[PDB]
Ligand binder design. Structure first.
Ligand SMILES: CN1CCn2nc(Nc3cc(-c4cccc(NC(=O)c5cc6ccccc6s5)c4CCO)n[nH]c3=O)cc2C1
Length: 264
């Protein structure tokens, strides 16, 4: 899906990410979109365009929808489904005192549904976290920026000892051997559940990344947030098995989440 940049209208600056400036605009004067303007040197562009077809085939309600790309010009554009309430982490922090427990679980469910679908397509996110989930005007959470980490050119982000690497969302096998799998996405999802139920707190606060790597290797895990039931915590904790093959699938996690709902 190559978009014609003439069909795009820029309206507002939405901020900055790993690829640079992100803008809000419209496609053909009607559809609200987000447009990532890829800073030169920030992306492995050839490698991205080479593997763009598969991202185009990924479609799910709880996945942020890709509209298309603009590659006949520089900077490259990536155009996506706009989400009015922005990223989940700040949404949690900003609406912290308004959340009911049922809502926190529905958020987990939204995300898990998306990841189950990705799991089914053998597609990895690689940087799952609240900051890379977005929220729309009706409070629906959707998974964002799935797979883009592979294309980042920044040693501080690509290196496990880098300052931007998602250490706090990474299992031991990633920090040690850089072995990404479904089960690394699983681990990350548990940390995400923790972000949700803690209402936007930073994992392992006052720990450095290295200290965090040290302690999870030694078996330390994130404490149960006040608003998390024991049933809920058991779900997120199951994502943090030292051994990846003892970790559940997203299909199972979703069943767990549904069972907790049903009981309530
Ligand atoms: C008043 N509020 C201001 C902030 N805000 N943001 C909104 N909604 C969106 C933000 C982004 C956005 C903004 C800044 C940075 C990033 N993130 C990135 O640019 C990147 C994230 C990652 C993750 C891994 C690897 C590479 C990248 S690039 C995004 C998500 C773009 O997909 N994208 N799409 C939206 O709908 C809505 C609001 C209303």
């Amino acid at each position: 899906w190559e978009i014609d940049p003439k069909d795009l209208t820029f309206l507002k600056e939405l901020g900055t990410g790993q690829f640079g400036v992100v803008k809000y605009g419209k496609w053909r004067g009607q559809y609200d979109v987000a447009i990532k303007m890829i800073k030169e040197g920030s992306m492995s562009e050839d490698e991205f365009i080479e593997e763009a077809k598969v991202m185009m085939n990924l479609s799910h309600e709880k996945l942020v929808q890709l509209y298309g790309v603009c590659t006949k010009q520089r900077p490259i554009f990536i155009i996506t489904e706009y989400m009015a309430n922005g990223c989940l982490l700040n949404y949690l922090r900003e609406m912290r005192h308004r959340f009911q427990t049922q809502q926190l679980l529905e958020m987990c469910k939204d995300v898990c549904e998306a990841m189950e679908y990705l799991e089914s397509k053998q597609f990895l996110h690689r940087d799952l976290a609240a900051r890379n989930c977005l929220v729309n005007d009706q409070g629906v959470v959707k998974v964002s920026d799935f797979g883009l980490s592979r294309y980042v050119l920044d040693d501080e982000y690509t290196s496990s000892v880098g300052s931007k690497f998602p250490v706090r969302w990474s299992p031991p096998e990633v920090l040690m051997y850089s072995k990404f799998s479904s089960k690394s996405d699983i681990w990350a999802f548990g940390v995400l559940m923790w972000e949700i139920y803690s209402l936007g707190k930073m994992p392992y606060e006052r720990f450095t990344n290295s200290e965090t790597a040290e302690h999870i290797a030694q078996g330390l895990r994130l404490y149960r947030p006040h608003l998390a039931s024991e049933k809920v915590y058991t779900i997120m904790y199951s994502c943090w098995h030292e051994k990846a093959d003892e970790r559940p699938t997203f299909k199972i996690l979703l069943s767990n989440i549904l069972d907790v709902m049903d009981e309530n």
